[PDB]
Design a protein around this ligand. Sequence first.
Ligand code: HEM
Ligand code: HEM
Lengths: 149, 149
Amino acid sequence: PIVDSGSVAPLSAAEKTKIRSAWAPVYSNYETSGVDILVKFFTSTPAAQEFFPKFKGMTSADQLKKSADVRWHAERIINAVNDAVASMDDTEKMSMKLRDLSGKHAKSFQVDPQYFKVLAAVIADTVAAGDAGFEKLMSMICILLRSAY
Amino acid sequence: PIVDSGSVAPLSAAEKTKIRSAWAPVYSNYETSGVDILVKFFTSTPAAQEFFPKFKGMTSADQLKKSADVRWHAERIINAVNDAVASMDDTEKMSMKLRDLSGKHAKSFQVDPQYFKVLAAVIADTVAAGDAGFEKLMSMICILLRSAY
Ligand code: HEM
Ligand code: HEM
């Protein structure tokens, strides 16, 4: 269950390893993985489309995927998660960046804090649906991405 | 000849239109474009290779191109030049971003500034060889990338 508030027990050594195993295949193809994930989240959540100005005009899966702006945006969203997994052994480091990234969303991108957990699930489902460990990493990211609000 | 110091005359309207016409084709396939340019720079400029710590172990086009790191790095570079062509009508914003990038290069990445113009040339020969207009933009960017040095 991915949350964006409250507390989440630390990540066991066992969980971390699994996460790295599942994420590797996905990331090795981040250009595609990021897109498909972002686009699905987009299309499946109409209420959160007004927060992607550079996407305006496009609404169908076909369009989105051919858009360079949709691609560049997907690649950054995905790498932000990669940086997270590659830093599960440093909570102080992970939190600082995500607190920074939280600031941009709240202060600059002005995105609704309620869609982070939604996109996160669209990531957990693709990376390893059902993994309590991965949903735990997400809960950590979502909690951080709301720290600025 | 691209330069990285002093100054250069503003880009005329004609030059801006020429630049945006030659750029579109290249940026359209940026995931591929960037990677081609980067590898061409890297492989052809030995001394500058030590400045790419994450490519530790790769020195051939084949190994490079098939790397997530090399591409992510290339995608970010090519996209910074894109922001630049996108801001030809607002040199202020262009400079703000480029100055920030300059600081990152001189502080975190510890990169020798002599190479900005060389990588810029690789981009010039790829987008529009010989075009004085584009060369000027590259000069503008390099002068800006060295401002924090
Ligand atoms: C899984 C959680 C998310 C992560 C890890 C994430 C990560 C990122 C990253 C790395 C950037 C790059 C910012 C930069 O270049 O400085 C970004 C940009 C952006 N994100 Fe998120 N994001 C997430 C969820 C969301 C959600 C739910 C929305 C929509 C409500 C959203 C909307 C945006 C917007 C508007 C931009 C700016 C695009 C631009 O103007 O270039 N993000 N995000
Ligand atoms: C046209 C010239 C150049 C542009 C526009 C450019 C742009 C960029 C951008 C946008 C980043 C992303 C930083 C971030 O993620 O916040 C970056 C990182 C980096 N650049 Fe450059 N760059 C240029 C030339 C060079 C040159 C000549 C070298 C090598 C001598 C170089 C070495 C690096 C390194 C080592 C990093 C850090 C990579 C990492 O650890 O992720 N760059 N550059």
